[PDB]
Amino acid sequence: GAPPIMGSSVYITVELAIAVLAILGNVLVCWAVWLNSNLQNVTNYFVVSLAAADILVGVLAIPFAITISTGFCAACHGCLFIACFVLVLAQSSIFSLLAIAIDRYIAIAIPLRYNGLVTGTRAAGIIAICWVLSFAIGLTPMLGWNNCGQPKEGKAHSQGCGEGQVACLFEDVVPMNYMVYFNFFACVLVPLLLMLGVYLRIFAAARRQLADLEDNWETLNDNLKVIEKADNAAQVKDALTKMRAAALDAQKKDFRHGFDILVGQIDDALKLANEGKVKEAQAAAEQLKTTRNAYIQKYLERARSTLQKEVHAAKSAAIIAGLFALCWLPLHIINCFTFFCPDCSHAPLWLMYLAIVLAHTNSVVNPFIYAYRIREFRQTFRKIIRSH
Ligand SMILES: Nc1nc(NCCCN2CCN(c3ccccc3)CC2)nc2nc(-c3ccco3)nn12
Ligand SMILES: CC(C)CCC[C@@H](C)[C@H]1CC[C@H]2[C@@H]3CC=C4C[C@@H](O)CC[C@]4(C)[C@H]3CC[C@]12C
Ligand SMILES: CC(C)CCC[C@@H](C)[C@H]1CC[C@H]2[C@@H]3CC=C4C[C@@H](O)CC[C@]4(C)[C@H]3CC[C@]12C
Ligand SMILES: CC(C)CCC[C@@H](C)[C@H]1CC[C@H]2[C@@H]3CC=C4C[C@@H](O)CC[C@]4(C)[C@H]3CC[C@]12C
Ligand SMILES: CC(C)CCC[C@@H](C)[C@H]1CC[C@H]2[C@@H]3CC=C4C[C@@H](O)CC[C@]4(C)[C@H]3CC[C@]12C
Ligand SMILES: CCCCCCCC/C=C/CCCCCCCC(=O)OC[C@@H](O)CO
Ligand SMILES: CCCCCCCC/C=C\CCCCCCCC(=O)O
Ligand SMILES: CCCCCCCC/C=C\CCCCCCCC(=O)O
Ligand code: NA
Numbered sequence: 001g002a003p004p005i006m007g008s009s010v011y012i013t014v015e016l017a018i019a020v021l022a023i024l025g026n027v028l029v030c031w032a033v034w035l036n037s038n039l040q041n042v043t044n045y046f047v048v049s050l051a052a053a054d055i056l057v058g059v060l061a062i063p064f065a066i067t068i069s070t071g072f073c074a075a076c077h078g079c080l081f082i083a084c085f086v087l088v089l090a091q092s093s094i095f096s097l098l099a100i101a102i103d104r105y106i107a108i109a110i111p112l113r114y115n116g117l118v119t120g121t122r123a124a125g126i127i128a129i130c131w132v133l134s135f136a137i138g139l140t141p142m143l144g145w146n147n148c149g150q151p152k153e154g155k156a157h158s159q160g161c162g163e164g165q166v167a168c169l170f171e172d173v174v175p176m177n178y179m180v181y182f183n184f185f186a187c188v189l190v191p192l193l194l195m196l197g198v199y200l201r202i203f204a205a206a207r208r209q210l211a212d213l214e215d216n217w218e219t220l221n222d223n224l225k226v227i228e229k230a231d232n233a234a235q236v237k238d239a240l241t242k243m244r245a246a247a248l249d250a251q252k253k254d255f256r257h258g259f260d261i262l263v264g265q266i267d268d269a270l271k272l273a274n275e276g277k278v279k280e281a282q283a284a285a286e287q288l289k290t291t292r293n294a295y296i297q298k299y300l301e302r303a304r305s306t307l308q309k310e311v312h313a314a315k316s317a318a319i320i321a322g323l324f325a326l327c328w329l330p331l332h333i334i335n336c337f338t339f340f341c342p343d344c345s346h347a348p349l350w351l352m353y354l355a356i357v358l359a360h361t362n363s364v365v366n367p368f369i370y371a372y373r374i375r376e377f378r379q380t381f382r383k384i385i386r387s388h
Contacts, residue, residue, distance in 0.1 A: 011353050012066050018360045019058035025367035026051035032380040039376055042123040043103050043317075047370075049127045050096040053089045054363035061086040062360060069353070071169050073161035076148035079168035080141050087183060088138030090328065090359075094191050095130035097321045099123075101198040104314050108205050108307075137187050145178050176339040184332045192325055199318045206311045210304065216250045217300050219243070220292065227269075227285045236281045237273040240266055243288075250299075258295025265291060316373040320366055327362035331355040 029051040033039045064082045074082075107114050151166045159167050166172065223239040230236045244266045251259045265287050272281035334347045334355055370377040 007350070008069065011069065011357070014357055015062050015066055015360065018357065018364060019062040022054050022058035022062075022360070022363035025364055026054045028381060028384060029367050029370065029377075030055075031384055032377055035384065036376065036380045039380060042118050042120055043100060043107075045120065045123045045127065046096045046099045046103065049130075050093055050100075050366065053092045053096070054366065056089050057086070057360060057363040061089055065356060065360070068168050068170055071159065071167045073156070073159055073165045074168040075164060076146070076151060076166045076173055077142060079166060079173050080146055080148065081139070082168065083170050083174050084139050084141050086138075088134045091134040091137045091187060092131055093324060094188060095134060096127075097317075097324060098191050098195055098198075099126060099130070100317050101195045101202070101321065104310070104317060105198050105202050105205070108202055108209075108310050108314070137183075140182065141174055141178060145175060145182075147173050147175055171338070176335060179332075179335045180339045184335065188328070188332065192321070195318075195321050199314065199321075202314045203311065206307055206314070210307050213250075213300060213303055213307075216246050217296075219246050220296070224285065224288065227282055230278065230282070233273045233276045233278045233281060236278060236285070237270065240270045240273060240281075240285065244270070250296075254295070255299055258291060258299065261291045262288065262296060312373075316369060319373070320369055323365050323369070324362055327365075328359050331359050 030048055033044050033048050064085055068079070068082050103118060106118055110117075148166070152172055155167045155169075155172070156165060161167060220243060223243045226239040227236050230239070244263060247259060247263050247266060251263075265284065269281045269284035269288075272284055334352065337344055338346060367381075371381055372378070
């Protein structure tokens with residue numbers, strides 16, 4: 001039985017190193033959004049709320065974690081607060097991650113009404129509501145779902161605790177059924193599975209919209225060939241009607257002028273076709289190639305470029321949500337083994353604190369993901385660092 005202070009010193013030192021990195025990195029995130037108006041959108045307001053939660057992990061949750069690892073004597077309800085405040089920050093992170101995913105689905109599924117529906121004022125109201133709900137969820141043990149009514153009196157007496165005090169240990173005061181059923185299953189696992197469903201819908205919507213862009217482009221060029229090798233006016237008419245319906249379908253200033261020319265030129269050739277002038281209709285339809293090269297192809301390439309940037313931005317946000325799951329799941333899974341298998345030996349002490357440190361490391365990783373995957377953040381980070 002090596003002296004407890006030795007293994008404790010390693011744990012505390014690692015925790016302090018994580019606290020400094022979580023504060024520095026996420027302060028840089030908040031500083032960047034404050035300074036750059038190009039980073040000031042609804043999506044990044046939830047990013048800032050997520051960074052504030054990670055800042056508080058280093059300022060409060062990690063000092064709280066170091067304190068409870070000592071098992072110090074404390075009034076049980078004060079011990080409860082130290083033990084549960086990290087659950088508030090974790091729940092806030094979940095709400096921010098879910099809001100980011102929903103925000104990106106709205107942008108890709110209904111971009112015409114995104115700016116009218118998703119505003120900064122409504123976003124700030126959602127952020128406040130989610131923080132209130134995070135305190136209620138994370139501090140639910142302080143409402144009565146705790147073990148303070150059944151204190152470990154032998155442990156308190158051996159540590160010399162005073163009357164009404166307990167040895168402040170996490171699994172002594174926080175019920176494991178709350179941690180597994182309420183916190184993990186209901187409040188962590190279900191929202192993460194919802195985020196998964198949202199991102200699946202995002203990428204499915206992106207793939208469908210890109211295919212529709214390419215299908216209208218192919219339909220335009222195929223029907224042009226049909227008109228060129230038609231032998232009667234009725235065949236030219238058939239191809240032109242399909243081109244006109246697709247042109248209006250692809251339309252839903254230089255963008256508008258290009259489609260205004262295209263639809264008008266289609267109506268010109270259609271009128272010649274209805275008069276039975278095949279050669280004259282085919283020559284009029286040949287003018288469409290000038291409009292296609294000068295206007296339509298540029299919109300196709302820009303619409304494609306915008307969708308691919310939305311896919312890339314959604315992938316970056318999904319990586320953030322996935323890294324949250326990877327960092328928090330081991331600790332939750334260990335609680336499941338403790339709760340569901342009382343015949344299994346408890347996970348060893350070194351593995352408990354490895355899982356605790358790993359969960360805390362999640363508060364360090366998000367600034368690196370933004371810096372490596374988002375150019376606007378990376379450039380703003382460099383300006384802040386260089387100029388300071
Ligand atoms: N489960 C849990 N524990 C702690 N801290 C106490 C660890 C040391 N114990 C010391 C006494 N035991 C022990 C006894 C013999 C051998 C090994 C261990 C249990 C662990 N902190 C937490 N945080 C979240 C958590 C937060 C969010 C999701 O899960 N679970 N958790
Ligand atoms: C704005 C920020 C900096 C304020 C932070 C306040 C924190 C540090 C305070 C608020 C409530 C406090 C707890 C209230 C009750 C108890 C029970 C006592 O038997 C031991 C200390 C303990 C567990 C306190 C520890 C410190 C504590 C968590
Ligand atoms: C900005 C918002 C979250 C305000 C923060 C205030 C919180 C952190 C403070 C304010 C008053 C504090 C409480 C005051 C008294 C007690 C009684 C003690 O037996 C257990 C701790 C407990 C329950 C404290 C826990 C922390 C506490 C709830
Ligand atoms: C989230 C991804 C990376 C999966 C992580 C799997 C981890 C959390 C799993 C894999 C194997 C598991 C261990 C396998 C066996 C035992 C022995 C039992 O007496 C207590 C739990 C304990 C010690 C498990 C704890 C959790 C564990 C370490
Ligand atoms: C997000 C995805 C990975 C789903 C989460 C999977 C979790 C809920 C699964 C993975 C492995 C599972 C554990 C595997 C083995 C045992 C031992 C058994 O005696 C009691 C249940 C218990 C402890 C399981 C509980 C649930 C469990 C922890
Ligand atoms: C123990 C005490 C600890 C205190 C806990 C504090 C928890 C609450 C913290 C919340 C941080 C929220 C910051 C999030 C800020 C988001 C940006 C915003 O909302 O403004 C943009 C829009 O307004 C545009 O119109
Ligand atoms: C930027 C503000 C950050 C706050 C710095 C606080 C750092 C100190 C970390 C942990 C303090 C833990 C004290 C341990 C409890 C006493 C031990 C015992 O009573 O047995
Ligand atoms: C963990 C317990 C959860 C508590 C369940 C019910 C509490 C929250 C209820 C409603 C939140 C909705 C807030 C709506 C505010 C109105 C905004 C407006 O005026 O436009
Ligand atoms: Na977090």
